[PDB]
């Protein structure tokens, strides 16, 4: 992931030292984010998958999906209609 | 994940030292986020999956999904209609 | 997850040292977040799944889903209609 | 992932030293991002997959998908129509 | 991934030294990005896949997809229509 380290040492027989660390930080910003909007989809025998990860830091993900065995998807004579469909997405 | 360490040491026989760490921090910001809005979908024999992770830090996720055995999805003569469908998504 | 450490040491035979750690913190901000809004969906023989994690720190998740054995989803002659459907999502 | 280290040392028998680290940080910015908007799709026996990762730092992802065994997708005489469909995406 | 290191040393028997590191940072910018908008697609027996990675730093991804075994996709006499379909994408 992330590893930081900061050291100082001295010996004897003025000083003003600075360490400033700023990784994912935001200052005076107007951030905005709008991932993954879905509208008016028709799914008959179908899959939709989304990872809408908006801001992760040092995050870990592990996935196993459908290792083994029969999948059958069958469709016939289905009727799907979208009419006058509008999507406005404005992550301003 | 995230590992930080800070050390200081001295020996003898002024000083003013600073350590500032700012990882995912937000200062004076106007952050806003709107992940994963879904509208008016028709699912017949269908799946929709979303990870709308908005801000995680050092988070860990482990998933196993449908390892083994028969899946069958069957659909016929279904009628699905959308009419005058509008989605407005505005993560300002 | 997250590990921090802070040390100081001295020996002999002024000083003013600082350690400031600010991980996921928010200062003076106007944060807002609106993950995962769902509207007017038709699920016939269907699944919808969402992880709307908004702000987690150091969080851990472990999942197992449908390891084994028959799934069958069957639909016929179903009628689904959406008419004049509007969704407004505004995570300002 | 990310590794940083900072050292200082001295011995004897003024000084003001600085270390500034700014990795993924944003200052005075008006950032905005809008990944992965989906509108009005028809999926008969079909898959749609999206990774809408908007801002990750040091993040790790591991995936296994459909290792083994029969997939069959069958569709016939399906009718799908889109009429007067408009999408506006404006990540300003 | 990314490795930084900073050292300082002295011995004896003024100084003001600076180290400024600015990797993926943005200053005074109006950045905006809008990857992967999808509109009005018809998928019969088909797959659509997107990685809409918008801003990753030091991120790692590993994927295994469909290692082994029969895939069959069959479609006949399907009718798909798009009419008056307009898409506007404006990552200003």
Author numbering:
A (entry chain E), B (entry chain G), C (entry chain I), D (entry chain C), E (entry chain A): 22 to 34, 50 to 128
Quote the study on this structure:
Using standard single-particle-based helical reconstruction techniques, we were able to produce an initial de novo 3D model from the 2D classes which could then be used for refinement of the irreversible fibril structure of human lysozyme to 2.8 Å resolution. The structural model comprises residues 22–34, 50–128 and an additional 12 residues whose sequence could not be identified, covering more than 2/3 of the amino acid sequence of human lysozyme. Apart from a region of tubular density which could not be modeled due to its low quality the remaining 1/3 of the protein, including the segment 35–40, is not visible in the cryo-EM structure, indicating that these segments are dynamic or heterogeneous in the structure. The amyloid fibril structure is composed of twelve in-register inter-molecular β-sheets (β1: residues 23–32, β2: 51–58, β3: 62–63, β4: 68–69, β5: 74–75, β6: 78–79, β7: 83–87, β8: 96–101, β9: 107–112, β10: 115–119, β11: 120–125 and a 7-residue β-strand of unknown sequence composition). The β-strands are often bordered by glycine residues (i.e., Gly22, Gly68, Gly72, Gly105, Gly127), by prolines (i.e., Pro71, Pro103) or β-arches. Further typical structural motifs of amyloid fibrils are present and include hydrogen bonded glutamine/asparagine ladders (such as the buried residues Gln86, Gln123, Asn60, Asn75, Asn88, Asn118). Furthermore, a complete unfolding of the native lysozyme is necessary for the irreversible amyloid formation as the sequence elements of both the native helices as well as the β-strands of the anti-parallel β-sheet of the native protein fold are incorporated into the amyloid fibril structure.
Here we go beyond the mesoscopic polymorphisms of amyloids from human lysozyme and HEWL, providing unprecedented evidence at the atomic level for the different folding motifs in the irreversible and reversible amyloids derived from a single protein sequence, by combining atomic force microscopy (AFM), cryo-electron microscopy (cryo-EM) and solid-state NMR. By combining atomic force microscopy, cryo-electron microscopy and solid-state NMR, we show that a full unfolding of the native protein precursor is a requirement for establishing irreversible amyloid fibrils. In contrast, under the longer heat-treatment in the presence of a reducing agent, native lysozyme undergoes a complete unfolding, which allows it to fold into irreversible fibrils, with twelve and ten in-register inter-molecular β-sheets for human lysozyme and HEWL, respectively.
